Point group: C2
Chain length 292, copies 2
């Protein structure tokens, strides 16, 4: 399946381009800076990063083709290619977001290639808006419609289960889609599904940036944003499996940690003030888990 | 064992009071706030923290004594210890950390399995030559009577443990680290941890005094904050006690006192070459030879 892989690479390259261009247009001011790299004895990647925009303070949209020999498949030729992104806006009234689309292929002697897709997208509000949370989920529900009646529900749930900090009993955001080990449908339907997912992120997230980017904000709201960003760093550094594999397997550190916020705050037993719009993020929005 | 294990407990209760009082004396303005907590299963602890003092911006010095049934399979256990992390306001005062603890697993019929663990370490931002070697000389001196290879073994261990491998970067200038310490009689291992606990006060407090009044600027605070992303990373990604505590039902906020009050991250962020900032990772963190 070398031709399938080439088709998938080409899609991801174009997806990265389209996602960067969409965000650039919406930012108006900053542009993404390209960083092409390689790894000894493996493939490499293209890391595109935006800093200090009029909207996006720290954005990353990375492509990587990771390789290697050896991960029953134990010494199998393993291969992973995907696009990963995290956008951290300046204005707390614009949510942070994240998306992933990735293919994994493992090849053995005397076996057909084992392949699966993975990915999803999700929204991480600070000062959430009811209309945006359901809109975000509606986009996700709509794109799933052609692929099965269970597909939104299954991957919406997976997203809630995965993006969870068990030790704080707390969701990371309001969810969206998450899936892994996807190979239950023929390859082509799977590939179309991740294509829809990549398209979905733009359809879901960009309008929300447009609606909210000019909401006025105070230094107090920035401060809360930064404490909420401690929760983001905690998940990525302690829990997230991809980040954990990337760092422990000697992947490209700065390409892997584009996810981290431009600044974070921690305090002993820090809690938002009760009865505020700050408290309602965790008391209501991160708790509802029912949007469509 | 019981009265020996209790002597250790009494030492750790006193050690927290002593460290906290020493740090309050250095600050002058702010005082530790105690949060007494109990663990479902047996025991608990006292978490003391200091915020927004003249010297210490975020400090935490914890004591705990946890015990109960089952983990040495299905053994009754006792775990006790003091751990601390101090993050000063002035970038010219280093961050520091210390830990001393005992674990005991008792067995019907047989003697208990036990070991000690702990150490201390210095994480400067604007490091100074004479402070790095003072810190290690306190370390070397306290070790000396215990044996000719104690400082070197545990100084080398400290370098090996507080190391961010994916960044090829030490967390700081090191100090002492040890775990699984039961190769000597209990009494001696015990005296060793008491020497380590006291060593932290002799090593760190004079450094706070020398540097606290050093002038600093918002730019050096910026550097301090990018460096504190490295600190958060090691604790959240690598540190064993932290990982373990968060995963297995430790008390979250007591475990995460180690985190900085503010951290920064930037894509491929590096200090400017040829500056005191660059000299941190180029010289001080690479030397690893201070006595």
């Amino acid at each position: 399946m070398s031709l399938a892989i080439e088709a998938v690479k080409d899609f991801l390259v174009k997806l990265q381009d389209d996602i960067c261009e969409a965000l650039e247009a919406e930012d108006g001011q900053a542009t993404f800076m390209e960083d092409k790299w390689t790894r000894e004895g493996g493939g490499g990647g293209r890391t595109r990063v935006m800093v200090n925009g009029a909207v996006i303070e720290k954005g990353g949209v990375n492509f990587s083709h990771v390789y290697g020999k050896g991960l029953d498949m134990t010494g199998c030729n393993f291969q992973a290619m995907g696009v990963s992104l995290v956008i951290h806006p300046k204005n707390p009234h614009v949510p942070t977001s994240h998306a992933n689309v990735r293919l994994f292929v493992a090849e053995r002697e005397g076996k057909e290639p084992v392949w699966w897709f993975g990915g999803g997208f999700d929204l991480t509000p600070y000062y959430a808006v009811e209309e945006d949370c359901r809109y975000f989920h509606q986009v996700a529900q709509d794109l799933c419609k052609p692929f099965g009646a269970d597909v939104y529900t299954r991957f919406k749930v997976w997203c809630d289960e995965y993006f969870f900090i068990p030790y704080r009993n707390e969701a990371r955001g309001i969810g969206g889609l998450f899936f892994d080990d996807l190979n239950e449908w023929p390859f082509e339907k799977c590939f179309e599904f991740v294509q829809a997912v990549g398209k979905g992120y733009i359809d879901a997230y960009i309008p929300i940036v447009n609606r909210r980017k000019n909401t006025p904000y105070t230094e107090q709201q920035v401060e809360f944003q930064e404490f909420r960003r401690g929760r983001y760093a905690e998940f990525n550094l302690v829990i997230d499996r991809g980040t954990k594999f990337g760092l422990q397997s000697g992947g490209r550190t700065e390409s892997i940690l584009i996810s981290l916020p431009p600044r974070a705050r921690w305090g002993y037993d820090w809690q938002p003030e009760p009865g505020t719009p700050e408290a309602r993020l965790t008391e209501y929005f991160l708790m509802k888990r029912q949007w469509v």
